[PDB]
Structure 1
């Protein structure tokens, strides 16, 4: 639903902070992915090759529980129990 490019300056061993502005969220599940790729071609790989990525849960979903009002039928014989609902028979 949303993609954005960035550049970060960090020398060997350095830790740097990255700030991501989040949208307003509904009852769905939301995951964030952060990746780093080759800016231009190398002798061993092409521009856009991913070298590193990580993923994080932003928000768990809200589960819905619905009350069913429609009916189910049941027929017994000597070997089988048969259960009918809508247009499926178990």
Structure 2
């Protein structure tokens, strides 16, 4: 969950040329962003350690991305060349006992069901 293996598949490019970033998303919204650099020659595999926070019953998702450190003839600083995402933790589902009532009215052509301020 905290350990990730990066593999450089460029023929003639070191991964040091790119700005690394990782983000953690709680139920879709983010909560933690960090930048990093990683040295890896063409072909090489390198490990990446990501400290994780204590996590409540929400659903957590990591996203790891590389971008352009500075402008290029074909694109501007920050442009994203590669990303991958992973489920950290699934969510805990709640189930709630409902005590409140529901009415019902039958007529020739309709069944009517009332609950709070909604009629079906």
TM-score for both structures, normalised by structure 1: 1.00
Deviation at 1:15, TM superposition (A): 0.1
* Number of residues of Structure 1 aligned to a counterpart in Structure 2: 90
Q: CA-atom RMSD, angstroms?
A: 0.1
Which ranges of 4 or more aligned residues in structure 1 deviate by more than 2 Å? none
SS of 2:88's equivalent in the other structure is strand
Question: Larger C-alpha radius of gyration, 1 or 2?
Answer: 1
Whole-Å Cα distance in 1 between the matches of residues 65 and 40 of structure 2? 15
SS of 1:9's equivalent in the other structure is coil
Q: Which runs of 5+ in 2 are unaligned?
A: 1-30
Q: Which runs of 5+ in 1 are unaligned?
A: none
Q: What do residues 30-67 of structure 1 show as CA deviations (whole Å, max 9, x unaligned)?
A: 00000000000000000000000000000000000000
Determine which structure has greater relative contact order: mean sequence separation of CA pairs < 8 Å that are 6+ residues apart, divided by chain length.
2
| 2:68 pairs with 1:51 | no
| Structure with a larger share of its residues in strand | 2
Whole-Å Cα distance in 2 between the matches of residues 66 and 87 of structure 1? 20
Whole-Å Cα distance in 2 between the matches of residues 6 and 69 of structure 1? 52
